[PDB]
DNA sequence: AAAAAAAAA
DNA sequence: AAAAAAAAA
DNA sequence: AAAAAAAAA
DNA sequence: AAAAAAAAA
């Protein structure tokens, strides 16, 4: 069944969590198997309430596709990226909620800021969580994401015995 | 049985697909096992017909060997490579069909063009599919190909328990 | 059960050993599984007594977290790092024992010195083991640690079949 | 049982083959397991007789340890290394046979020469096989060796389920 | 014997 | 449908 | 709760 | 046929 092993970073103003969501397959009637819904690396941001305590109730999610992951793992020290998502895309509720994830180098080069911005035009809200990530932490993510990439793409099914 | 989990890139004029084809083994009569036919990373190109629709019927294939894969994964941002294949090599139908795959940096350095050219002297045809690949996409391929390399070489059979 | 396969470096004044300690999980009552205690890469230092012989009785341990590992694997040739640990942290016996691990480039750039310093204010002792590590050896550690990182984080549980 | 999946390079004057030899373990009476004899990446060189044919009878072997592998995978384009081995080391027949493997950059930077030199003072012979390796081929070896490194060290036994 | 804790299904 | 072959247990 | 879709065995 | 040894559960 499920497995819950997130890599988490807890900082002053918010927490950040990351974990793979594996792809789903379908057993063709030809006998073989076929990849159905794509894996992602799910990012969870949540707010620090009171003192070193965190409000899981107010979390926001951002799903990194294979291609966004490749974008993060191939980032230089001075590079930055920005991803834009609509959860209710190609559906009835589109344009209402808008998420943007930005990864920017801090001035020192000592790391990066990762922030999730959520604008909800239905509930008339505007949230923003930012978490600083050291060079070491981002190194864990780079290495963990690279490990995970083949798996969310379903390439770990190509094995000899 | 089979597993179908291609990494695909869909662009203006054509689509590109990539997936490992595992090596085949033979159970020696000595008891052990021996690698028989070599794995490849198969590339499939196909043409965009009408509007964001793609003509799977007109696809062309290109099989990357272990060594060609090593050539792609070790490419710098400014490097380019070109591979030349005859499907009916060392057989009766050689010289008739000629395939060439070129990976070139786009001017921006924002990625690469991958194109397959097929010249068929039997059917008197000349096809060319080109697909632009961003830095992020080519990063997925590099990471996915590196993951896959040991597997198509059959080295995933060397495992402790 | 247990598995004992340390990578070891034996030098003039001391020995150094490194091996992963896997994370522990808990089978939720929801059916799924949940990561409980975190994996580390355990480092063991011990003193050379007499001539090319080593006093296992006087060993000192240092547990690298996921994040410390990411710090070591992402070190340039000229970089150095220093980690500080209190084994009896957040408990009753804190402040008494203090461990610090330093990884510094040797002058040549031919490698690094890895040293563990242990100050025990209970037993009134002060130990220091230093082991030089060549570029090749540190390359084994970098590659072995990167391989191990996903595993100590419990990400090897996310697998397709 | 055995598995035979060598990566091979066939050139003008000789052939080169490479494959992992896994470590051996012992089931402790404590229940757990303990690594016994170390894995290597075995290199096999053999001479080209006549025209594109190769004399397997005259092969010479060279066993790369974990540390030698780390030395090869961390080589820059312009780096070179040289390893020296006595097969009958610490035994009665030492000093008699002497093997040396050299990896040097070719002038172009288009690759490397890998050569095995064997001097046998018992049989009064002196053999030398040299095989040029392109950047692509050496990229396969680097990637395949890095994949294999954890395995020959027995670290693939540290797995979650 | 090991630096811990912070959300949660 | 795929570029092959070269040593061998 | 998650940005989707495009070929196909 | 292979470069070995050094601590230990």
Question: How would DSSP label each residue in C87-111?
Answer: TTTTSTTTTSEEEEEEEEE-TTSSE
Integer CA distances (angstroms), A107 to A77, A111, A134, B80, D103, in order: 11, 8, 12, 34, 42
**Burial grade of D140 (CB within 10 A; 0-12, 13-18, 19 or more):** buried
CB B87 within 8 A of CB B60: no
CB contact (8 A) between residue D5 and residue B155: yes
Alpha helices in D1-158 (DSSP H): 66-73, 135-152
- φ, ψ for residue A48 (rounded to 5)? -80, 115
Q: With a 7 Å cutoff on the CB, does A42 touch strand G?
A: yes
Q: ∠ CA(C71), CA(C93), CA(C103), 5° rounding?
A: 20
Q: Of C79, C90, C70, which is closest to residue C142 (Cα–Cα)?
A: C70
The three-class DSSP label of residue C68 is helix
> Tokens in use for C84?
């500080």
Burial D8-31 (b: 16+ CB within 10 A, else e): ebebeebbbbbbbbbbebeeeeee
Q: With a 7 Å cutoff on the CB, does B45 touch strand F?
A: no
> Tokens in use for C11?
């030098």
CB A75 within 8 A of CB A105: no
Which residue is nearest to the C1' sugar atom of E7, using CA? A56
Name the one residue in this structure whose structure tokens are 């000229």: C78
Give strand ranges (E) for chain C. 3-4, 7-10, 14-21, 24-27, 33-37, 40-49, 53-54, 60-64, 81-85, 97-105, 111-120, 125-134
Q: d(Cα D16, Cα D4) in Å, to the nearest integer?
A: 15
Q: d(Cα C142, Cα C110) in Å, to the nearest integer?
A: 15
Q: ∠ CA(D31), CA(D21), CA(D17), 5° rounding?
A: 170
CB contact (8 A) between residue C22 and residue D69: no
Which residues have C-beta within 8 Å of that of residue C41, sequence separation ≥ 6? Answer: C18, C19, C20, C21, C63, C64, C69, C145, C148, C152
Q: With a 7 Å cutoff on the CB, does C120 touch strand E?
A: no
Q: d(Cα D108, Cα C137) in Å, to the nearest integer?
A: 29
CB B120 within 8 A of CB B126: yes
Solving technique: X-ray
Q: ∠ CA(A142), CA(C105), CA(C118), 5° rounding?
A: 90
Residue B31 touches chain D, beta carbons under 8 Å? yes
C window 37-56, beta carbon within 8 A of A: none
CB A105 within 8 A of CB A112: yes
Helices and strands counted in chain B (H then E): 2, 12
CB D143 within 8 A of CB B149: yes
| CATH placement of domain A1-161 | 2.30.31.10
CB under 7 Å from strand H? C 2, 4, 6, 8, 10, 15, 17, 44, 46, 52-56; D 21, 28, 30, 32, 34, 38, 40, 42, 61-63, 65, 83-87, 89-90, 97, 99
Q: Of A118, A119, A112, A115, which is closest to residue A141 (Cα–Cα)?
A: A112
Label the pairing between strands C81-85 and C97-105. antiparallel
Residue B147 touches chain A, beta carbons under 8 Å? yes
Q: d(Cα B70, Cα B89) in Å, to the nearest integer?
A: 22
Query: What is the spatial distance, in angstroms and rounded to an integer, between the CA atom of B56 and the C1' atom of G8?
Result: 7
Q: d(Cα C115, Cα C62) in Å, to the nearest integer?
A: 11
In sequence order, what are the beta bridge partners of D24?
D37
Query: What is the spatial distance, in angstroms and rounded to an integer, between the CA atom of A91 and the C1' atom of G4?
Result: 9
Distance from the Cα of A118 to chain C's closest Cα (Å) equals 28
């Amino acid at each position: 069944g499920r497995v819950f092993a997130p890599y988490s970073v807890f900082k002053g103003k918010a927490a950040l969590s990351a974990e793979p969501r594996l792809p789903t397959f379908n057993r063709l009637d030809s006998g073989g198997v076929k990849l159905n819904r794509r894996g992602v690396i799910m990012l969870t941001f949540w707010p620090s309430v009171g003192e070193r305590k965190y409000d899981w109730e107010k979390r926001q999610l951002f799903a990194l596709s294979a291609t966004e992951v490749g974008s993060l793992i191939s980032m230089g020290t001075r590079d930055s990226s920005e991803f834009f998502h609509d959860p209710s895309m190609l559906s009835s509720n589109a344009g209402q909620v808008r998420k943007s994830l930005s990864i920017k180098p801090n001035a020192d080069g000592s790391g990066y800021f990762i922030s999730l911005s959520v604008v909800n035009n239905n509930l008339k809200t505007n949230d923003r969580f930012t978490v600083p990530v050291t060079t070491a932490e981002f190194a864990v993510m780079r290495t963990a994401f690279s490990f995970a990439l083949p798996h969310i793409m379903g390439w770990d099914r190509f094995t000899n015995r």
